[PDB]
Each structure stands twice: as C-alpha cells, then as structure tokens.
Amino acid sequence: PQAKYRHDYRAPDYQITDIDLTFDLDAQKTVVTAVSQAVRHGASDAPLRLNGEDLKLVSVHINDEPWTAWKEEEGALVISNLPERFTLKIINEISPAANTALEGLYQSGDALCTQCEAEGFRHITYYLDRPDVLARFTTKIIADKIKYPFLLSNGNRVAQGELENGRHWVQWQDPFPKPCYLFALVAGDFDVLRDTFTTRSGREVALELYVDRGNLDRAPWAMTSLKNSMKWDEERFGLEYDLDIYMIVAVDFFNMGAMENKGLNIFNSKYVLARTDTATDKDYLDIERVIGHEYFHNWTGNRVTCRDWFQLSLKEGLTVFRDQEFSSDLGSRAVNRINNVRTMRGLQFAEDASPMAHPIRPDMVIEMNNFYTLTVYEKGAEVIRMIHTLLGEENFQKGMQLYFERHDGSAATCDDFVQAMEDASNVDLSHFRRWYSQSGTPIVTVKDDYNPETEQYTLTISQRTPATPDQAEKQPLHIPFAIELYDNEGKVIPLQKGGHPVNSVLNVTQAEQTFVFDNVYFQPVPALLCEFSAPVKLEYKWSDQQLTFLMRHARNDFSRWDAAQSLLATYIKLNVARHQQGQPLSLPVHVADAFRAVLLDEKIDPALAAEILTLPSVNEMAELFDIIDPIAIAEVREALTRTLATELADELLAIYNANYQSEYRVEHEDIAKRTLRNACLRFLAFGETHLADVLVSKQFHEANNMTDALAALSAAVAAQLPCRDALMQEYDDKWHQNGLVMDKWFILQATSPAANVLETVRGLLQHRSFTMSNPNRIRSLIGAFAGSNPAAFHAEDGSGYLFLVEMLTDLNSRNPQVASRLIEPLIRLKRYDAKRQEKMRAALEQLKGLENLSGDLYEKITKALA
Ligand SMILES: N[C@H](CC(=O)O)Cc1c[nH]c2ccccc12
Ligand code: NA
Ligand code: NA
Ligand code: NA
Ligand code: NA
Ligand code: NA
Ligand code: NA
Ligand code: NA
Numbered sequence: 132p133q134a135k136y137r138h139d140y141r142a143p144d145y146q147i148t149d150i151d152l153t154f155d156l157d158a159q160k161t162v163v164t165a166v167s168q169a170v171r172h173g174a175s176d177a178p179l180r181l182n183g184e185d186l187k188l189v190s191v192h193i194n195d196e197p198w199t200a201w202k203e204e205e206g207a208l209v210i211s212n213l214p215e216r217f218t219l220k221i222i223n224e225i226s227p228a229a230n231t232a233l234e235g236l237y238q239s240g241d242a243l244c245t246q247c248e249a250e251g252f253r254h255i256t257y258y259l260d261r262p263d264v265l266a267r268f269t270t271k272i273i274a275d276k277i278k279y280p281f282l283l284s285n286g287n288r289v290a291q292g293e294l295e296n297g298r299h300w301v302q303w304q305d306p307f308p309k310p311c312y313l314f315a316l317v318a319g320d321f322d323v324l325r326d327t328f329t330t331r332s333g334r335e336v337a338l339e340l341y342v343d344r345g346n347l348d349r350a351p352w353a354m355t356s357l358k359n360s361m362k363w364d365e366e367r368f369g370l371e372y373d374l375d376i377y378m379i380v381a382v383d384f385f386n387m388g389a390m391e392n393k394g395l396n397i398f399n400s401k402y403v404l405a406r407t408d409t410a411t412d413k414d415y416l417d418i419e420r421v422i423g424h425e426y427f428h429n430w431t432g433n434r435v436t437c438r439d440w441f442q443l444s445l446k447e448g449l450t451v452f453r454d455q456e457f458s459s460d461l462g463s464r465a466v467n468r469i470n471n472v473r474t475m476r477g478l479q480f481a482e483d484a485s486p487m488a489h490p491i492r493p494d495m496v497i498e499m500n501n502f503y504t505l506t507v508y509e510k511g512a513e514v515i516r517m518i519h520t521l522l523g524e525e526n527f528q529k530g531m532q533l534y535f536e537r538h539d540g541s542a543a544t545c546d547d548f549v550q551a552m553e554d555a556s557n558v559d560l561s562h563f564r565r566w567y568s569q570s571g572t573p574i575v576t577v578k579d580d581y582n583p584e585t586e587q588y589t590l591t592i593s594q595r596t597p598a599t600p601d602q603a604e605k606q607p608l609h610i611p612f613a614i615e616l617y618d619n620e621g622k623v624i625p626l627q628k629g630g631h632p633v634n635s636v637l638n639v640t641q642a643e644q645t646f647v648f649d650n651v652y653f654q655p656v657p658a659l660l661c662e663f664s665a666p667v668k669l670e671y672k673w674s675d676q677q678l679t680f681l682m683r684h685a686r687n688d689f690s691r692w693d694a695a696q697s698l699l700a701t702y703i704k705l706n707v708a709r710h711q712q713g714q715p716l717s718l719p720v721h722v723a724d725a726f727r728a729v730l731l732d733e734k735i736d737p738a739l740a741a742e743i744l745t746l747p748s749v750n751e752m753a754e755l756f757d758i759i760d761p762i763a764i765a766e767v768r769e770a771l772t773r774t775l776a777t778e779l780a781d782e783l784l785a786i787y788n789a790n791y792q793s794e795y796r797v798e799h800e801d802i803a804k805r806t807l808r809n810a811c812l813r814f815l816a817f818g819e820t821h822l823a824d825v826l827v828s829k830q831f832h833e834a835n836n837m838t839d840a841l842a843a844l845s846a847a848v849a850a851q852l853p854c855r856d857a858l859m860q861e862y863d864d865k866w867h868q869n870g871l872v873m874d875k876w877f878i879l880q881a882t883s884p885a886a887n888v889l890e891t892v893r894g895l896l897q898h899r900s901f902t903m904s905n906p907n908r909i910r911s912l913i914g915a916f917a918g919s920n921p922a923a924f925h926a927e928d929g930s931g932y933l934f935l936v937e938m939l940t941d942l943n944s945r946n947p948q949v950a951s952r953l954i955e956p957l958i959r960l961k962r963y964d965a966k967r968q969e970k971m972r973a974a975l976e977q978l979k980g981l982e983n984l985s986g987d988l989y990e991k992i993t994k995a996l997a
C-alpha cells in the first residue's frame with residue numbers, strides 16, 4: 132500500500148456537477164446505476180480516473196454510447212478520449228451481505244445502511260471519491276416493500292411509486308452540492324419518533340429519529356438533544372438549519388460514533404438510545420455531545436467541506452470545539468474543561484509521542500481511516516480554542532462569519548480558516564499556523580523571581596518540542612500562556628508594567644523570553660497555563676503549599692482541580708519508585724488534609740469536588756514517566772485509593788449520605804451530587820471490607836437508575852468485594868439480551884483487577900451477548916482489555932500480547948478499521964521496559980506476516996517497527 136502526500140494535492144482533471152443514482156436493493160446483490168454529468172478541466176489526453184473497490188462493473192456509457200476506450204486497474208476505472216462535457220453512465224453490482232468491514236453499503240441487523248467517510252463511496256460505485264468534487268445528488272431506491280418499508284436518502288422526498296412483485300420505490304433530492312463522503316442510504320423497518328423544530332427565522336423543520344422496532348421509549352432524550360443543538364447553534368454561532376427535514380437513524384453495527392451525512396445522520400445506537408434504567412449520566416451527556424457534534428457539522432463540514440483529507444481537522448477540530456462549547460454552555464464549563472484536559476494529557480499526549488505521531492494537518496497518509504485521531508480531533512480543538520483565546524469571542528465570531536462568507540458551498544483548507552480568522556480579527560496568525568504543521572507536545576519551562584526592592588515579578592519562560600518519530604525538525608510555537616498572580620490573602624494581583632495594564636494571556640513566541648510585572652506588592656503564588664490555555668506540558672517547581680493554596684483560592688475551578696493534579700503527580704511518581712523497591716505507600720499528611728478540606732468545604736461545587744476526588748487514570752499517570760511500569764502504576768493507584776479511604780473514612784461516609792437523592796433527574800445539579808456521591812462510594816469500597824460490601828450491595832439493589840447501579844457494580848469489581856460475583860451474575864441475567872447494556876459489563880470484566888482476568892476475557896468470547904461481528908461488543912471486551920487494563924495486557928509473560936495478536940488475526944480480515952483501533956496499545960512498545968518491548972515487537976512481527984495484511988494495520992505496524 133502506497134503513501135499519499137499533502138504536497139501532491141492538485142485540482143482534479145474532471146469535475147462532476149450532478150449525479151443521479153438508482154439502487155435496486157437486495158442484501159445479496161444490489162445493482163447501482165449512476166448517471167453523472169461531468170466536465171473535463173484538464174488536457175484531452177488526461178483520462179478520467181474513477182475510484183472503485185470491490186465493484187462488479189456491468190456497463191459504461193458516455194452520452195448513451197457504450198464506451199470502448201477504458202480499462203480497469205487496481206482500484207480504478209480509467210476512461211479515455213472524452214469530450215469536454217458529457218454524461219457518464221455506470222452500472223455495477225455490490226453485495227451488502229458480504230460487507231463485514233462496514234464501509235460502503237452494508238447490513239446492520241435486517242437494515243441496509245451506508246458509511247462513506249472517508250473513502251467508502253468508491254465501494255458503492257465508480258466515482259471521483261475525493262471531497263473537492265461536489266455534486267448535486269438525486270437518489271432513487273427500489274426495494275421489497277415488506278423487508279424495507281422505509282427507504283431513506285439525503286434531502287427531500289420528491290417521488291414515490293409502487294411496482295409489481297411487492298416492490299416499491301422512493302426518490303430523494305438533496306439540493307446542496309456535496310462531496311460523496313456525505314452520501315447516505317438507509318433501508319429497513321423502524322419505529323419513528325417525529326417532532327418539529329422552528330428556526331429563529333421561522334422555518335419549520337421536521338425531525339425524524341429512526342430506531343429499531345420497540346425502541347421508541349429510548350428516543351426522546353436524543354430528540355431533545357437535537358432540538359437543544361439547533362437552538363444553541365442559533366444562539367451562539369447565528370447558524371440555522373438549511374433543509375426542511377432532519378433525519379437520524381440509530382444502527383447497532385457502526386465502526387465509529389456517528390456520521391454527519393447531509394440531512395440523514397447515521398448514528399451508532401450507543402449515542403442515541405437512553406432510558407434511566409439502561410443509561411448512566413455519562414451516557415446521557417455523551418448522547419447530547421454526539422448529537423450536537425453531528426448537528427454542528429452541518430455548517431462546519433457540510434456547508435463548508437474539506438479540499439482533501441489532509442485537511443480533516445478543518446472540520447473535526449472546529450466541530451469538536453463546537454461540541455465542547457455546547458456541552459460547556461449547557462452544563463458545567465469547569466467539568467467539561469477538566470474532562471477534556473484529562474483526555475488531552477492522558478491519551479493525546481501519548482499519541483503525540485508514539486510512532487503514529489502526526490501534526491493536526493498530516494503531511495503523509497497511507498490509510499486515511501487511521502487519521503480519525505485524538506490528535507486531529509482533540510488537539511485540533513485545542514488549536515481552535517487557542518485561536519479563540521487569542522481573538523476573544525467577538526473577533527472569533529467575526530472570523531466564523533468571514534469563513535462562511537468566503538467558503539460556503541465549497542471545499543476549503545485549514546489555511547483558509549486561519550486566514551479568515553486573521554483577516555476578520557486583525558490578529559496576526561502567521562506564526563500560529565505552525566501548530567498545524569508541527570507534531571509533538573511542547574514542553575514549557577517557567578522560572579520566576581520576586582524582587583522585593585522593586586516590587587517586580589519576573590517570569591522566564593522557555594519552550595522546546597522534542598523530536599518525534601515523524602519529524603526531526605522542530606521550531607518554537609505561538610503559545611498563548613495565561614497567568615494569574617495571587618497575594619497572601621488569595622486575591623488577584625493586577626498585572627501591569629510601567630504604569631499600564633498587561634493582558635494576562637502572554638504571547639510565548641520565542642525559545643526563551645522574559646516577562647516583567649510591576650507593582651507586585653507581595654510575593655505571589657502564580658496560577659500558570661490557566662484553563663489549559665495551550666496544549667503543552669508545564670515544568671515549574673511548585674511547592675506543595677503553593678498547590679494547596681491554589682486549591683483553596685484560585686478563581687477558576689479548573690485551576691483548583693489542576694493544582695490538585697500537580698499535588699498528586701509528585702506523590703504518584705514517588706510511590707511508583709517505592710513500589711519498584713517493594714516498599715509500601717508513603718504520603719505526607721498535608722496531602723490527605725487537602726482532600727479532606729475539599730470533602731468538607733460547604734461552598735465548593737459538588738461537581739468540582741467530585742473531579743478533585745477522581746484520581747488520575749492509569750493513562751494519565753503513565754504520561755508522568757519516561758518508561759512506563761503498568762503494574763506499579765495500577766498498584767499505586769489502588770494503594771492511594773486505600774490510603775485515602777482509610778484516612779478520610781468518616782468524611783467520605785458523611786458526604787456519601789449527604790448527597791443521597793431520592794428522585795433521578797438528568798439535570799446538572801443532580802448529576803454533580805450523584806457524581807460526588809459515587810466518587811465517595813468508590814473510595815469507601817476500598818475501606819473496611821464489611822462496611823464496603825454492605826454499602827455496595829445495597830446501592831446496587833436499591834438504585835433506581837443505571838448510574839448508581841453501575842457505580843456500585845464497578846466498585847465491587849474494582850475492590851474485589853465479596854458481593855462481586857452475585858452482582859455480576861444478576862446483571863447478566865437481567866440484561867443479556869441488551870447489547871448496549873452488556874457493553875458496560877464486558878468493560879468491567881475486561882478491566883477487572885482479578886488475577887485470572889485474561890482467562891475470563893477469553894471465556895467471554897463465547898458469551899451469549901458477545902459477537903465478533905459487532906464493533907461495540909469488540910471494543911467493550913477486547914478493546915477495553917488491551918487499552919484499559921494495562922496491568923493485565925502487559926502481563927510479564929506476554930499473554931496479553933498473544934491474545935491481542937489472535938484477535939487481530941481475525942479482525943484484520945473481518946473489519947480492519949476496528950483492528951486498527953485495537954492495535955494501538957501494541958504500537959506503544961517504546962514506552963515500556965526492554966523485555967516487554969521484545970515481546971511486543973515479536974507480536975507486531977507476527978502480524979506483519981499475515982496474509983492479506985490490511986493497509987490500516989500495515990501503516991501502524993511499519994511505523995511501530997521502524
Ligand atoms: N465524520 C465522522 C465522525 C464524526 O462526526 O466526526 C467520521 C466517521 C464516521 N464513521 C467512520 C468510519 C471510518 C472513517 C471515518 C468515520
Ligand atoms: Na449528455
Ligand atoms: Na463538482
Ligand atoms: Na455552563
Ligand atoms: Na475530550
Ligand atoms: Na478586531
Ligand atoms: Na507536586
Ligand atoms: Na497516557
């Protein structure tokens with residue numbers, strides 16, 4: 132498989148302006164007729180190269196003449212000797228039932244559905260499958276009326292008919308030009324939740340949510356969230372929906388979360404279906420964010436699309452930023468910011484140090500499905516957020532308005548976006564553009580001085596980005612570095628220099644620079660990189676008492692949490708070193724005391740308390756170390772949990788009881804109290820065993836909603852309490868017919884600290900609720916083991932590696948996209964000790980030798996082994 136390079140982009144030799152599709156649908160053999168109106172822009176000797184994969188060509192006509200000047204080669208139909216303007220007609224066959232990879236047109240249970248992003252439309256017919264070719268689509272669908280009573284495609288339903296032999300047809304027209312990755316087709320039988328939303332200007336939009344028969348009771352929250360999304364995009368960004376119908380279809384077989392196909396979004400059912408006995412608070416908030424995300428793509432992705440796939444972050448960074456803003460505006464902005472920072476530091480930073488490191492705008496791709504990444508998405512959003520920090524809301528909105536004014540109806544680049552922001556705001560972003568071209572996490576080092584004679588505070592800030600596997604050359608970035616200075620009473624010291632206020636967002640643009648502040652009337656305690664103002668590692672030599680001071684006084688809730696993280700980090704590092712010498716945990720009492728103060732502070736928001744009381748994950752802890760010891764990290768996390776549970780036992784129980792709520796509501800104050808209560812329970816589960824077992828068993832049985840039931844079950848597994856097996860078995864007996872609910876249980880099994888966890892995981896491959904044909908089941912059992920149980924995955928005997936090789940040997944042939952997601956823990960081999968490296972390298976060499984190695988895996992394996 133061949134690399135493609137961003138610098139090789141060229142405008143296409145041909146455009147298509149209009150495509151009329153007919154599908155004669157059948158799960159075994161579908162016949163596609165595609166009539167495209169085309170225009171040749173290049174030279175007469177440049178042939179038309181149409182992408183096509185696994186298609187059976189039936190016929191090719193040019194202006195209704197059977198065409199003899201063509202050939203088929205690997206992945207392409209190459210058509211020569213064409214006029215300047217012509218009608219292309221292709222007929223071809225495909226087989227949805229054979230499509231296990233879930234790209235193109237495939238089967239989801241008894242439904243037929245599509246996924247075309249990035250390059251799936253070429254699995255449906257021969258086409259210019261590239262996102263800088265926009266065309267107006269019409270789609271006619273012909274099918275068996277009993278099996279497929281609903282026949283959906285993008286746009287408006289413009290025609291309908293009945294045929295002989297129990298067949299019917301519908302035709303759809305989507306008036307907005309689109310690239311083909313935005314095409315969708317759905318055929319099947321569903322229940323339909325119907326509602327309406329009236330836009331700010333008075334357009335009435337029909338809303339239709341298609342779910343599997345019997346699931347209407349699980350649809351209203353997603354409907355509510357769609358309406359909320361529509362209203363919010365009007366209020367925040369001034370954006371209205373542009374069609375008269377908005378369709379969402381929930382399907383059980385889907386590789387990612389959802390897909391923004393124009394007017395016909397297709398969703399993994401995980402991010403649609405919710406009822407209080409089946410879904411947690413987090414599931415409700417995820418549904419809200421993913422419904423929002425796909426909605427927001429209607430402008431940032433659909434109305435303006437991507438020139439080429441290197442520009443993916445143009446839509447993904449900006450749409451993630453939008454979904455974060457939505458969630459943050461509706462919910463707790465602090466909890467949102469905290470969680471997104473956890474993801475960046477604990478998962479994205481690791482990618483940026485890995486063999487798959489890339490800039491948010493990649494320069495080189497072999498398989499584009501490998502680049503739907505933490506980096507493109509989450510770091511992409513941080514980059515957009517930096518623009519927001521530099522411009523402020525008003526200028527940022529002006530940049531959005533200029534971006535749409537220039538590029539509405541076209542395919543654009545990341546550079547076009549940055550230029551719109553610069554031109555509308557008058558802020559220079561020439562240096563800032565380097566965040567698009569440079570991979571790796573910058574390390575910002577801060578040293579400071581207080582001069583009591585002049586009342587000056589001096590900050591010397593330096594930056595460096597280490598070389599990454601993809602880039603040997605690194606340069607300084609334009610880093611927005613937000614600060615605040617606190618006096619001894621916890622009040623903010625005004626920032627000023629030479630009699631003038633100074634903006635608290637410092638522009639760190641050099642390898643090293645100094646900033647001097649005047650009128651600093653007391654030796655300050657600084658809050659540094661406030662609200663994680665740039666996606667960087669911070670090196671500053673905090674004292675523990677500066678950190679506990681910030682936990683108490685800092686103005687933004689984020690800084691309070693982050694100070695607590697820095698306080699913990701030091702003692703995590705200590706305790707991993709101690710573990711490796713066989714010593715027990717050591718922790719100064721003033722640390723336990725800082726957490727006791729949080730638990731007993733009556734003025735603190737319970738949402739914030741809960742996040743302070745949620746220890747860093749094993750992934751976040753891993754990022755503290757040059758060489759990861761996953762066993763020591765897991766054991767230290769547990770021991771820190773046990774120690775705090777013992778030290779804070781009375782306080783934990785008091786807060787647990789005080790946050791009891793008899794009614795369940797999906798409402799931010801209620802969620803916050805319940806999240807705190809459950810954080811207390813999780814510590815309590817690691818305390819005295821009898822009381823633990825009683826609290827946990829009782830919560831599980833009395834819970835009137837899945838958030839509280841799963842928090843209990845999860846605590847029983849984590850702490851290996853006596854009730855564990857009985858509770859787990861009850862869950863299975865109650866919920867085995869419900870795959871989404873069982874995913875939660877598979878995750879608990881896969882992440883269990885029990886000694887025989889691998890053996891249980893292998894056994895669960897035969898469980899009545901498991902199947903290798905379903906990406907959700909695969910991720911919940913296999914993926915959770917490999918990704919979220921690093922202590923077991925990284926068992927010294929190599930057994931976790933061998934297990935993953937076996938699974939991936941199947942998945943390489945069945946569903947390479949899922950295979951590539953699952954291989955990720957193995958490509959991190961350089962972060963581990965020599966003996967684990969040896970074994971992981973041998974696993975990777977084994978996979979490298981598979982027959983029919985997919986491009987998806989080949990890319991990752993070759994980078995990892997280099
Ligand atoms: N824009 C969507 C997801 C999103 O909204 O960002 C991308 C997507 C969905 N399913 C896929 C399968 C393979 C490759 C890409 C995808
Ligand atoms: Na013609
Ligand atoms: Na076009
Ligand atoms: Na809010
Ligand atoms: Na995130
Ligand atoms: Na301005
Ligand atoms: Na510290
Ligand atoms: Na990590």
Ligand SMILES: [Zn+2]
Nearest residue numbers: 424428447450
């Ligand atoms: Zn997206």
